[PDB]
Structure formats: structure tokens, C-alpha cells
Amino acid sequence: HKIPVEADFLYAYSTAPGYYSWRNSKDGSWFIQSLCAMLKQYADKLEFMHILTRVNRKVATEFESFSFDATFHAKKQIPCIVSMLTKELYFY
Amino acid sequence: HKIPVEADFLYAYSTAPGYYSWRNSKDGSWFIQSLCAMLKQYADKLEFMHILTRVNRKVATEFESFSFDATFHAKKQIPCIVSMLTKELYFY
Amino acid sequence: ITVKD
Amino acid sequence: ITVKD
Amino acid sequence: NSYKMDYPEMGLCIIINNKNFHKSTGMTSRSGTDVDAANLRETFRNLKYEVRNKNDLTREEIVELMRDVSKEDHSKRSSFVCVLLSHGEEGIIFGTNGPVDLKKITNFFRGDRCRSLTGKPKLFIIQACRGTELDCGIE
Amino acid sequence: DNSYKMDYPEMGLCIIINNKNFHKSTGMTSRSGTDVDAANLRETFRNLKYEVRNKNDLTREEIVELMRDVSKEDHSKRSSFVCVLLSHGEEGIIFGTNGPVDLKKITNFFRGDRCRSLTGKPKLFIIQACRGTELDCGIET
């Protein structure tokens, strides 16, 4: 009969709850860089959750902060996929 | 070559942030019922995140609360997949 | 019946 | 440089 | 099974790109976000979304835009995508002039409030901080 | 690699914390049916070759202690780690039989720097518990 009014949302967060998100002053945010690269390469192949899981790995393994302020230097980031979706999502 | 300390966690919540979670007094909680059914049916065929999406759909569409207290009656529920995983997870 | 957690 | 958001 | 993605159109992709904040907020400008917004424009153009880019919105213009779009008729659209590039904290995104709660934005699209998107996937991509914890990593 | 390595000698631990009965000084009702959930979970994860460890009616300090001891175990020949929590709750919070524990307190024992024999391995948390008092009235299709 009915569905929850909260169903069928997906929140792709750039960072874990509580944490800072990192951005490169010339190349853009780690997360959006990686999301656009993964979509370009896999959006005609992979389901959305699996593209977003590859975004997680790219950000987690390839990015580390460079800061002239030591407090902000050599930091890491894991994005945070939050799915109230009820079906798989394919972009083609 | 580090990884984030918050990486490779998966949080399978029975319900969306802020909301009640429902449980049948005899049959068990909607979420665990569905998670056990979905794992039995599909742990041999599907990646974990796709199993959890079928869980979302089972809970979202098949369940609706039944309460003599009209305040709590005909309510709905969507679970919440919170994934900081960096690879796909296959149980087979 | 259904009850809340 | 890396900066925070 | 899987969302029906063969409606006449893929849907809207709304990109809110806040670079320059009012100095009364004490917020630095987000240099590089223009590269992000343009990357997102091209990416979603290639997936067939009608991309609408917005720039430097106050929190009231964010709420008003989100309301207006949620009252558009999406009957012929398969999905909805919203990208928020800004400063933030947990639960909160910043317009140019102050914070606005994320749940205020997403609520306009609830299944009961945007009938022409009921049953269709609503994607929120959020580039923003969620607090002040630091992940020092492990080797 | 695209997939976690799941062919370690053992799949890993699956810890089930089933809190049915609470202390009278908490006032919260008994949780009927959770025994069916905990038994369902035990059989499901045995069929997936996990070492299931059921716990019943743990206090908030017994939870924190069990999680700490498990975090100090040696998971080097385990593929993953699973923890299931059945209890009352609120946003961020799981209840012992005598009061609240922060969920972040439990999961922090397994951060990649604090439990090295699980670094790079999937750590799953399945949480049956309320996260507030909002009610979804749904919408007719």
C-alpha cells in the first residue's frame, strides 16, 4: 500500500560524521574530484552504490592533506554513503 | 600511505535518523526479520550493499505497524545504510 | 502487535 | 594548498 | 530490482556553489569550488541531467530555491540530484550569510510533499564539513 | 582490488548483544520478540561461517568491557568483524540494561589505529534500536 516518506533518499557525504572535509585550493574538493572521475569511468557499467564505494577508496587511499599549518597537515578523509534507497540505480 | 581510521566501517541501522524503530512482539523486529531473510536468499548471489537495499525495500513496502493505540498505528519505516567501506563485500 | 524500540 | 570546509 | 530510469528526462541536477561568504560570518572563501562546480556540470551533462548552476546563495535563497523546485512537476523525470558545495557542520550547510539545517532542504522532497517524485531516487551530494574532528590515519 | 579479501582461514566473529530486560530504575518496557531476532541472527551468520557469540541483558559497562576485550583479540586470520546490537536507543545511543552508552564509544575500539589486526577489513555494525521519537506516517502509492 504505502511507503515511508523518508524512503528513496541517498545522501552522499564527502566526509564521516563529525569530521572536517578537505579541499584543494586549485583542483577542488577531494570528494568531488573523485566522484566526477568515478562517474566518468563507470556510470555505464556499475551500480551507483558501487561507483560511490570506489569514490570512498580513491579519497581514502590517494589523498592526504598538505598544510603549512602542522595542525591541518597529513590528514585523511573517508566519505560517507547514507542510503534510504529501495532499489539499485543505473544511469544508462 | 595511510588510510583513514574511520574507514571500512558499515553501519546498518534499522531506521532513519530521528525515527522510531518498530518490532513485532512475537515475530521480531521488522529490520532483523528482513535482514535474515534477505541474507538467506541472496548471500550467494549479491554484493552486501545490494542485499541491504533489498532489506530497505522489504521493510519499506511489506511492513506497517498495527497498534490498538491510534497514535502508533499504520506507521512506516525505512532503514538506513551508512557505509564507509572501500571495497565491495561478497559472502560467497 | 507492533511496539517501538 | 589543502584547506578545510 | 532497480529504479525505472527511462522516463523522458533523467531529471534536474541542482548545483549550489557557495564561494564567497559575508565577512560577518567569519568564513573564508572556498577557492577551488569553481573547479568542482564545473566538473559536476560536465559530468552530469554527460549523464543527461538538466544541470542548473546557482552561485553564492544566502540561506534564504537556498530555502526558497529548494521550495520552488520541489513544487515543479517532475512527472516526466526519472530522478532528482542536488549538489551542495559550502561550509558546514553536522546537520548544517551554510549559505553566504548563515547556517541552514540540511533536513529543512531535504524535507521539501519527502514522499508526501513532492508527489511527482514519490518512488523516484533523490540524490543529495554534500561537499561540506561536518564538524572539527581530524583523521590522522594509520599506515 | 575491488573486493575485500574474504578467504582468510575464518570469516570472523559475529557478536550479538541482545538486551531484552532492563532495570526497574530505567522504566523502559521489556522488549518482546528480540529473542526471536537473536536466534534468527545466530542461524543466519552460522550459515555464513561466522563464529557467533550471543550475549544477553548486558549492562552499559558490561557492553563497553565486552567491546574492549574483543577489540584486543587477534583477528589476523579473520576476514571481517560483525557486531549486532538489539536494544532500546536514541540518536547516537544504545542502551545497556541500566542506561545509555554512546554508539561512538563502542565503535571507537575498532578504529583502524586502535585495532590493527582489523585494519583494512570490513567492520559491520547492525543496530536494531530507535533513533528518536519521530513517526513516519507514509504516503499511499
To the nearest 10°, the Cα dihedral for F114, B47, A62, E125? -100
Bridge partner residues of E88 (DSSP): E93
The three state secondary structure string of F55-82 is: EECCCHHHHHHHHHHHHHCCCCCEEEEE
Pick C1's closest partner by Cβ from B20, B21, B68. Answer: B68
Looking at the annotation, which residues of F are catalytic? 88, 130
CA distance E79 to F114: 41
Interface of F with A in 112-141 (CB under 8 A): 136-141
Tell me which residue of E62, E69, E133 sits closest to E101, measured CA to CA: E62
SS3 percent helix, strand, coil of chain F, rounded to 5, is 30, 30, 40
Residues after which chain C is discontinuous, using a C–N cutoff of 2.5 Å? none
Selected residue of D2, D3, D4, D5 to mutate for chain E interface (largest E Cβ count, 10 A) = D5
Q: Which residue of F has its CA nearest to B8?
A: F122
Q: Where do we find the cell 554527460?
A: E46
CA distance E138 to B1: 8
Pick F113's closest partner by Cβ from E111, E115, E138. Answer: E138
CA distance E122 to A3: 15
Give all strands (DSSP E) within A14-54, no chain letters. 22-24, 28-29
Residue B92: CB partners within 8 Å, gap ≥ 6?
A: B43, B44, B45
CA distance E34 to A26: 9
Experimental determination approach used: X-ray
Question: Sheet containing A22-24: which strands, arranged edge to edge?
Answer: A28-29, A22-24, D2-4
Bridge partner residues of E93 (DSSP): E88, E100
Instruction: Give the minimum alpha-carbon distance from A2 to chain D in angstroms, rounded to a whole number.
Output: 39
For chain B, how far is it from start to end, CA to CA, in angstroms? Answer: 30
Q: CA-CA distances (angstroms) from residue B54 to B92, F71, F129? A: 18, 31, 20
CA distance B81 to B79: 7
Residue F84: CB partners within 8 Å, gap ≥ 6?
A: B32, F14, F15, F16, F17, F41, F125, F126, F127, F128
Q: Per-residue DSSP letters for chain E?
A: -B----SSEEEEEEEEE-----GGGT----TTHHHHHHHHHHHHHHTT-EEEEEES--HHHHHHHHHHHHTS--TTEEEEEEEEES-EETTEEEETTEEEEHHHHHHTTSTTT-GGGTTS-EEEEEES--SSB-B--B-
Asked if residue F31 lies in contact with residue C5, where contact means CB atoms within 8 angstroms, the answer is: yes
Pick A66's closest partner by Cβ from D1, D4, D5. Answer: D1
Q: Which residue of E has its CA nearest to B53?
A: E1
CA distance B29 to B20: 12
Choice among E22, E87, E114, E136 that is catalytic: E87
C1 is written with which cell numbers? 502487535
Contact A2 F139 (CB under 8 A): yes
Contact A1 F137 (CB under 8 A): no
CA distance F123 to B10: 6
Contact C2 B22 (CB under 8 A): yes
Domain count, chain B: 1
Tell me which residue of F22, F85, F19, F38 sits closest to B28, measured CA to CA: F38
Instruction: Give the minimum alpha-carbon distance from F113 to chain E in angstroms, rounded to a whole number.
Output: 5
CA distance E49 to E41: 9
Give the 3-state secondary structure of residue B5: coil
**Domain enclosing residue B65, as ranges:** 1-92
In total, chain E counts a number of residues equal to: 139
List CB contacts (< 8 A) between E31 and chain D: 3
Q: Does residue F129 sit at the C interface (CB-CB below 8 Å)? A: yes
Selected residue of A22, A31, A33, A76 to mutate for chain D interface (largest D Cβ count, 10 A) = A22
Asked if residue B43 lies in contact with residue B51, where contact means CB atoms within 8 angstroms, the answer is: yes
Neighbours of chain A (3+ CB pairs under 8 A): B, D, E, F
CA distance A59 to A14: 9
CA distance F19 to F94: 10
CA distance F104 to F16: 17
Selected residue of A84, A87, A89 to mutate for chain B interface (largest B Cβ count, 10 A) = A84
Contact E139 B4 (CB under 8 A): no
Give the 3-state secondary structure of residue F135: coil
